[PDB]
DNA topoisomerase 4 subunit A
Amino acid sequence: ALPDVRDGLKPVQRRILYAMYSSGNTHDKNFRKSAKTVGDVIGQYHPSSVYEAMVRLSQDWKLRHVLIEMHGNNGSIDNDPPAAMRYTEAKLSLLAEELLRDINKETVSFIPNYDDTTLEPMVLPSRFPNLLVNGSTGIGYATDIPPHNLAEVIQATLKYIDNPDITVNQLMKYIKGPDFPTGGIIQGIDGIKKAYESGKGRIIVRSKVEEETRKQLIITEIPYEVNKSSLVKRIDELRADKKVDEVRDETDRTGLRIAIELESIKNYLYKNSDLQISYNFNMVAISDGRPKLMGIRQIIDSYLNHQIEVVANRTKFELDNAEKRMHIVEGLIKALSILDKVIELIRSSKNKRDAKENLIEVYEFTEEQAEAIVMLQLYRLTNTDIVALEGEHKELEALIKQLRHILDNHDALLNVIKEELNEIKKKFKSERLSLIEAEIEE
Amino acid sequence: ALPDVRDGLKPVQRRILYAMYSSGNTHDKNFRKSAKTVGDVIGQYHPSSVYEAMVRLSQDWKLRHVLIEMHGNNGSIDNDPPAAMRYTEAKLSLLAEELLRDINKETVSFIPNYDDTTLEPMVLPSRFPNLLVNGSTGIGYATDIPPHNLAEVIQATLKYIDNPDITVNQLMKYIKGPDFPTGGIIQGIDGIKKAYESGKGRIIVRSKVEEETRKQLIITEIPYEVNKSSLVKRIDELRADKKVDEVRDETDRTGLRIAIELESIKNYLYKNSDLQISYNFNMVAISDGRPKLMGIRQIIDSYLNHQIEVVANRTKFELDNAEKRMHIVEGLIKALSILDKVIELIRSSKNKRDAKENLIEVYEFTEEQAEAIVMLQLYRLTNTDIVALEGEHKELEALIKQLRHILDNHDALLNVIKEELNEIKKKFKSERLSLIEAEIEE
């Protein structure tokens, strides 16, 4: 079970968001029961673990940007079981909708489902680099891709588009390093560099720890993946065992807060516990069919190739439609002028297909346009309609020239990608939760 | 959890067949994965036990007529677990389709689902007396309604329609008694009588047992609900313990066959085992909101009231439509005659709603007919169409007079019920599997 480099998803996850998308379980509409969405997945795509994944996508503390907004007990940083799918409601993020944006536009390959009745997508348009942003973990191959700051990833992608040769150091002006949703302090600037070239590097991850007003120490933020209650109980035991020479979980729904009362003790606790943790990049994802360990530029490169594919496919889709429609229009204006003859000619013919033939064989019409004309409801013969069909021709010759230029010119296309990526970063920009310091302390 | 008297279903079961119906998981089309249907039930109607019920409806040995046709391991008379919903395929019986017949015709009440997004039915049209035919069991009230012979139940219902005063003895000319799908011999003609009046009676149920070619005894058929493997293992132990003074389950996919080799021994085994069993009617179902214990004529009466409701509601539905359409037709023929004026008049008006008004305010048209005319595709002005709309008027004045007569005349309606019930019994007639003998042996 490994994610695709292009949209950062495992097949469990992709299946869940798509089912949500097609049900119309979008952000702008009301929350929907979790079972409703779950029962479409086991039933149509995946042959418990559906719900365990759907839940995981809805967690503040695991993903930098949730893809599902869940209402109800969705678990906890203490690894509490979530509620059952009947009380729990969910819907897509505004941001998950960007992953799915344009899917309705022949952009990504669709493939038969497990029982060969319906079709599902191999990959999502992924209109933003989800793989780096939300990362991935878990297993015969394992992955460790930490989350990253949305805006830092887009800007870097944008910089890559302008210079496909840009070094790892240069991208680090814009992707500074992992941006963990639980925040904390990061140590290992070389580690990030090593990871960003070879796919593999060691960093140290610290808790945010300050002193208070007898003096008391508070843990405001903890390392990524670490279990709070599990950590509380660890700090608890050493206090008891006098390995240190009391420990309250003052967390409430406001934010995380762990208080300790009784520097050297801060430096001790870091070691014999997960107050300080190490993280090791193992950046593996699915490129071109197989598992590929890859550094930052292969990943940006793979994403870019994906976008180019998507956008070129969207543009061709929108062009074919704009081509097909103007043809109808050309037909209609032509038939609007011979209107009176047309109506008499239709009455003259006996069958539906007769009328179509006696249209194409008498006047210079085609099947496509003959069909459209015989299908006009009588109200389409009114003034508003006999004139709004004349105007849209202008708006079409406009779109053709525009869209054709996007296909004929590679730069123009990349500009399209650049604009769309850019507006996404503005609309969804979020501040860095992780502090980065260069050296690792001992 | 108790069945409704009208359609014999519990809410689990009704929900499953309806979901199957609306998915189009009908008999004439291909089998469909079980998960596909299951995942619609937990997801849309029921807040494991869905599958345990869906399975139970698919069993030869529990229902006289299965409502689901299942392909794959669907359990066994030995209470074997069934396969998981991913290998197992299913679809509706021809007979379950009669339960659902006419549901698409404003016949039965529809009610919001658990989450108030969609609508589900309170009861099924149940175009045949499912409650008696397939029976029901299980629990703070319990039920025991054994299965009955389809044709015996319809004929009796038919006899009740002609004489709503018919005695319990007289119905027993046509409903002879329970018709068990595992067959066997029944004993207790008085028991059936008592059950058919008061809802409560004791019968004895026997296995089919004959001798063979050292002499060997074979059990061909066993009592209802009894577990084969459980019974084999019982006969096994007494042989071992010399309580009798060896036991092979020669069952294969052909039919049931239990062989014993080593009258008085047949008469012994009947007692200290479930080779002979007793059954006790506890005929309880849901009438008019509450649990009601009822004998045979209340049940036939309740079913009949249901049919009358259904058929009267179907007829009113089909009449309103036939009323609404002839109105369009009356309009169309009228407009077909002023055709040339009509088209010029449409061009004269500026908007859609203008054209509708300038139709109703100039010529004697209504909204309903004005809408229909402006919506005509241009091909509907051809000869085949300018003439097929003139003819169907004949077929409509025909249907009105027919249908109106069904509403205005109660006998005519009951005849409709009688015809439809009758054809069902002919098309689905099946022979009695249960032998009935009057007295109980000691």
Remarks:
- Chain B has one domain: 1-442.
